[PDB]
Design a protein around this ligand. Sequence first.
Ligand SMILES: NC(=[NH2+])NCCC[C@H](N)C(=O)O
Length: 129
Amino acid sequence: AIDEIKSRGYLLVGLSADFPPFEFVDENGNIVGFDVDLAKEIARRLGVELKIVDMTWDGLIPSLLTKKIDVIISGMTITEERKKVVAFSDPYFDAGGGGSGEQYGIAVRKEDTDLLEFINSVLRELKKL
Ligand SMILES: NC(=[NH2+])NCCC[C@H](N)C(=O)O
């Protein structure tokens, strides 16, 4: 998965831009927010451009499974149910503090274990700061 993204020259991140402050569309029509910033960080570290694909919430896992996006970064709670279908990064946002509550993760296809590893190393470096 990594070599393919690097050859393509961009990282395709799906989200649903209706969830400020994680992703939303600002007053100039730009998609912005915490998840966009994180997506940019990951893309930079991969040495690729970022392409954000905005879609309806329900569209995201399908698009991931069918390879139209590489990852979901869209305020998605890590849950045991969803782990039946996708893999999740380490948590990057804790809604409750102390790891209580919803923890958000980056969803990746289960077979893309190299991508998942890579993302985890970026989250681990960012948390070190
Ligand atoms: N971009 C969005 N609409 N995100 C909604 C996230 C809601 C909730 N954290 C979930 O994972 O279902």
